[PDB]
Amino acid sequence: MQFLQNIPPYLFFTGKGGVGKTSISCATAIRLAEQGKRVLLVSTDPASNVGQVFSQTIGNTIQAIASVPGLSALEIDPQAAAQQYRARIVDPIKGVLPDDVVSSINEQLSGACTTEIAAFDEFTGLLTDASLLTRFDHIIFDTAPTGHTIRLLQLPGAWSSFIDSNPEGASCLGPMAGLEKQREQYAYAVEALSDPKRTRLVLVARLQKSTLQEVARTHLELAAIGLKNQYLVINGVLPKTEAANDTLAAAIWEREQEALANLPADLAGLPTDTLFLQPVNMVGVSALSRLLSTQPRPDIPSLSALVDDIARNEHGLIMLMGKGGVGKTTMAAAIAVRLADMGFDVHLTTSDPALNNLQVSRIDPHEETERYRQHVLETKGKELDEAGKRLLEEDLRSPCTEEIAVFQAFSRVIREAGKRFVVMDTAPTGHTLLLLDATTTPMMLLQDPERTKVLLVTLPETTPVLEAANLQADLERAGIHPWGWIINNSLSIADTRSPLLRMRAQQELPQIESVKRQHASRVALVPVLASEPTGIDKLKQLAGHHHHHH
Ligand SMILES: Nc1ncnc2c1ncn2[C@@H]1O[C@H](COP(=O)(O)OP(=O)(O)OP(=O)(O)O)[C@@H](O)[C@H]1O
Ligand SMILES: Nc1ncnc2c1ncn2[C@@H]1O[C@H](COP(=O)(O)OP(=O)(O)O)[C@@H](O)[C@H]1O
Ligand SMILES: [Cl-]
Ligand SMILES: [Cl-]
Ligand SMILES: [Cl-]
Ligand SMILES: [Mg+2]
Ligand SMILES: [Mg+2]
Structure with a gap:
């Protein structure tokens, strides 16, 4: 797999919910560990299940995955981070402003945007800590930040300006006032994301016209931003050796083959690898490793x-x-x-x-x-x-x-x-x-x-x-x-x-x-x-x- 060759110290997987970001993250984490590399898998999903797949518990502390030497994990719960992030803004004015006011502001910090910004605060932390690369060769993330979030933090106005508290528009700008790291670190982080020598972005997709449309969109946005070290991984592809008997499987294999061949233009010049649809949802080292095979x-x-x-x-x-x-x-x-x-x-x-x-x-x-x-x-x-x-x-x-x-x-x-x-x-x-x-x-x-x-x-x-x-x-x-x-x-x-x-x-x-x-x-x-x-x-x-x- 091309996406597995020469991975830089930072690897991010991006794609819609359910495409297989985490699975591929874990499988990659294992592959690298078995090659003698020191890998840190960073679980970033709301209700992380990475601990489950590896049969152990993980948390906001770096812990080794006993069931596979060379690999350690760490969970960055986004809901918790959002909570703390919101509380870090509101607690100070709690008791100084009316309750309906503190109540309204709190709601302004309860959307998907506050979560992305708080998640970015965490990414920034890991990305700006050189010591980590002193302990690991690779740090793998099972989600990636959006172009939107990166733009926001790279805008000069986000640092020198302030926008009134009106009802329309800036509705989601409230989280910005919550950043506590210095401007330079966020820019450094973005610098790390835009450096192909340090970060590789893997777009995960499925062989479906609708999904490839979105992925192609993400690719363009992240590239214009500066992330140009991108790889395409098409997951869950149906093996032709299944379209044999059944008529549905044949219709599916057909639908995928057309798309696979008619991939959106932007994704065409991208190094691409395809993974096969597995029989059972991976739950162990064995099952996960099987995912990276070149043959059904x-x-x-x-x-x-x-x-x-x-x-x-x-x-x-x-x-x-x-x-x-x-x-x-x-x-x-x-x-x-x-x-x-x-x-x-x-x-x-x-x-x-x-x-x-x-x-x-x-x-x-x-x-x-x-x-x-x-x-x-x-x-x-x-x-x-x-x-x-x-x-x-x-x-x-x-x-x-x-x-x-x-x-x-x-x-x-x-x-x-x-x-x-x-x-x-x-x-x-x-x-x-x-x-x-x-x-x-x-x-x-x-x-x-x-x-x-x-x-x-x-x-x-x-x-x-x-x-x-x-x-x-x-x-x-x-x-x-x-x-x-x-x-x-x-x-x-x-x-x-x-x-x-x-x-x-x-x-x-x-x-x-x-x-x-x-x-x-x-x-x-x-x-x-x-x-x-x-x-x-x-x-x-x-x-x-x-x-x-x-
Ligand atoms: N039951 C189904 N069987 C086969 N294909 C389906 C089914 N439901 C949806 N699709 C296909 O999946 C694609 C996505 O579905 P659809 O456009 O309805 O999703 P949506 O949630 O409205 O999308 P968006 O969020 O992009 O507006 C379509 O191209 C569509 O024909
Ligand atoms: N190629 C595949 N074949 C079969 N099952 C897969 C494949 N990729 C993922 N899955 C199974 O699919 C779900 C998709 O999930 P997952 O990796 O958790 O990702 P995401 O981070 O993309 O939401 C899981 O139940 C998983 O074990
Ligand atoms: Cl929002
Ligand atoms: Cl929000
Ligand atoms: Cl009836
Ligand atoms: Mg996941
Ligand atoms: Mg729709």
């Missing part, structure tokens, strides 16, 4: 049942939520189609390009975001100096900015949810709704269980379910309780003779049980489609069927 039904109702229940009231705001790529848009489309075929007036709204009983409102997120950014600039940038304006423009470059702008656009038609059905394929986070509420926002409507039905879409996989769970908890803090969960891309409810797909379908079981037993009131299982759910044809196939009853 649940009792849950169909989407149809969920929709029949959504259909009872005969109207309502239906919002699909979840992480990027889980299938929000497809479920939104599938739901809107079935509801319409049941004879109801349905208004589907989307933020992506794709009978008369159904109307579709397409919104371009790019222009909504710009209308928004433009608005926040006439409002706040008014008295900012140029450096500060750039800081404000980078803050309005946050994920949540688009999220907010698109919701505001949708809100234009939310008033129709009273007479009929309005289905949305994306929504802001709990944190963001709470923020907007303090500012416009139909908060009460979203919180009403009879008017709004929020659905959480996820995958029958560990990380996705975890991230889904956390989204839900955040929404609940905003008084919104998801009405049901949709587990998309399931091999369990799929027709396959392929021995490997069956072994994979069996891996989902504990994840699916998790959702039913601990995360959701209602659940729907959608199959991994043998085709691209692009036509209303295959879109109707996703739903399955629901037997009428009284």
Whole structure:
């Protein structure tokens, strides 16, 4: 594997939730250890499981992994770091300012942005400690910082300017005032990230058009920033020696082969390695090492049942939520189609390009975001100096900015949810709704269980379910309780003779049980489609069927 050759002292793995960042991190950690190298694996996931895979406990202290000499680990819990980070800002003014005030500021430090900034504070610590390279040859991170976070800390304005405490725009700039290291260390860290002699960035992806799109995006952003030592690792690829008998496995192998060959242009000139889809979720040194080789039904109702229940009231705001790529848009489309075929007036709204009983409102997120950014600039940038304006423009470059702008656009038609059905394929986070509420926002409507039905879409996989769970908890803090969960891309409810797909379908079981037993009131299982759910044809196939009853 090219990504394994000549790794510099700092190695970072980046990619969407569930692509396999941690697995590959551990497997690489082992490979290096067995070569006689001293390796430090840095676990950075919210609910770390690296200790589990290695059959021991790890913590905020560097401890050796007894089950593999040469390797040690360290956990950097991001939720805890965020907590301490927020508390380090608020505790000082606690008792000096009103409670509602300290309460509002605390909320401003409870979003994904504060977490990335606090996580960057930790990365900076490790990256600027030369002594570490005195003890190890390699330091491996199972997540990487975003281009957004790096930009923010490299902006001069972030150091010489300050932005008022308004309701819009700079909403997420609050964390900056929390940095306690000197400006020079953060710049040094970024310097270390941009040095190919010190840091190698590995983009983890899967052979899917949608995912490669995102990865290609990340690559460009991190490169313009200065990280040009990038490697592409395509994980979980299906071996042709499985497309043999079964028809689904053959359709999949085909879908991957097209993409694999039609890789986005930007990723083409990138050194690339592919890993194979393993039978069982790696859990030991043996299983993990096997990953780096060069050679190879649940009792849950169909989407149809969920929709029949959504259909009872005969109207309502239906919002699909979840992480990027889980299938929000497809479920939104599938739901809107079935509801319409049941004879109801349905208004589907989307933020992506794709009978008369159904109307579709397409919104371009790019222009909504710009209308928004433009608005926040006439409002706040008014008295900012140029450096500060750039800081404000980078803050309005946050994920949540688009999220907010698109919701505001949708809100234009939310008033129709009273007479009929309005289905949305994306929504802001709990944190963001709470923020907007303090500012416009139909908060009460979203919180009403009879008017709004929020659905959480996820995958029958560990990380996705975890991230889904956390989204839900955040929404609940905003008084919104998801009405049901949709587990998309399931091999369990799929027709396959392929021995490997069956072994994979069996891996989902504990994840699916998790959702039913601990995360959701209602659940729907959608199959991994043998085709691209692009036509209303295959879109109707996703739903399955629901037997009428009284
Ligand atoms: N059940 C399924 N079977 C096969 N493919 C699916 C399924 N659900 C989604 N996909 C495919 O996966 C891709 C991602 O899904 P989709 O665009 O609906 O996700 P999303 O969460 O709306 O994405 P984003 O977060 O990018 O807006 C699509 O190209 C789509 O056709
Ligand atoms: N190529 C692969 N084949 C089969 N399973 C894999 C592969 N890569 C990862 N997994 C399994 O998939 C999940 C994806 O998780 P993981 O490494 O934790 O990553 P991330 O950090 O990308 O969320 C785990 O259940 C894991 O053991
Ligand atoms: Cl945020
Ligand atoms: Cl935040
Ligand atoms: Cl019925
Ligand atoms: Mg992980
Ligand atoms: Mg979408």
